[PDB]
């Protein structure tokens, strides 16, 4: 349920939630004050956090 | 459910208190000042 709902939202989102690269995704989640979240691999997420 | 809700496009901090929801007490205050002036002048 939960993940499918998130998928449906992301496909049905305007402007574009998706990104073309990890670097731009991190840059965007930084750009939005708290208005963006990024779903990515745990290891990469921890590394970016550090 | 799927086509009415699963495709559903749909499902704050307290604000400072504005001059509009204490305006009445200001009106009463100025009215009372006017009334007081009138009474003093009558006396």
């Amino acid at each position: 349920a939960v993940f499918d709902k998130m998928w449906t939202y992301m496909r049905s989102a305007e402007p574009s939630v998706f990104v073309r690269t990890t670097a731009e995704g991190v840059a965007r989640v930084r750009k939005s004050k708290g208005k963006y979240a990024y779903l990515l691999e745990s290891t990469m997420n921890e590394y970016i956090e550090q | 459910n799927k086509w009415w809700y699963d495709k559903g496009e749909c499902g704050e901090k307290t604000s400072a208190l504005s001059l509009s929801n204490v305006a009445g007490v200001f009106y009463i205050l100025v009215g009372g000042l006017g009334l007081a002036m009138l009474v003093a002048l009558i006396e």
Binding site: - | S18, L19, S20, A23, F26, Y27, L33, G34, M37, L41
Partner: protein
């Protein structure tokens, strides 16, 4: 001293009247972000009567604010439309000026100075009611312009001059009883 007090009262009265008259005729009350001309949102002047535009494709254009695009709301809408209270403030300040002018001539009456005091105080009260009505009418970002603060400064000066007039009348009756 009596001479200095009278001069200061007269100057204050003139300053208050000038300030309020400028404020009630000028347009820089509310730096909101509205529409210069309709029937693209940009900065505006939005005075008491005409909402000139600014910083848009076309500047300087002014149109009379659309008053009246709930009887409780209807009465407030009507009172803001006429701006009776700002205008009544101006009138009362003018009448107080007339009283102070008649002070020097046809003097020894002692009750026209009291009249000036009462008119100035009443002008201040009218001004404060007007400010509240205006600010309430616009609750349906922004900033306030120099004409609004001209109105505010008018209120403070009017109250000071009223205090001066009342104190001066008291001094006159104190001298008379001695």
């Amino acid at each position: 001293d009596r001479g200095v007090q009278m001069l200061l009262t007269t100057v204050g009265a003139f300053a208050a009247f000038s300030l309020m008259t400028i404020a009630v005729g000028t347009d820089y009350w509310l730096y909101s972000r509205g529409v210069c001309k309709t029937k693209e949102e940009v900065m505006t002047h939005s005075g008491l009567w005409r909402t000139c535009c600014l910083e848009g494709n076309f500047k300087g254009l002014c149109k009379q604010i659309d008053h009246f695009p709930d009887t409780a709301e209807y009465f407030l809408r009507a009172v803001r439309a006429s701006s009776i209270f700002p205008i009544l403030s101006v009138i009362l300040l003018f009448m107080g000026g007339l009283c102070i002018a008649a002070s020097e001539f046809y003097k020894t009456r002692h009750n026209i100075i009291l009249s000036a005091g009462i008119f100035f105080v009443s002008a201040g009260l009218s001004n404060i009611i007007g400010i509240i009505v205006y600010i309430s009418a616009n609750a349906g970002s922004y900033s306030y312009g120099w004409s609004f603060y001209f109105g505010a400064l008018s209120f403070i000066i009017a109250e000071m001059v009223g205090v001066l007039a009342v104190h001066m009348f008291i001094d006159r009756h104190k001298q008379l009883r001695a």
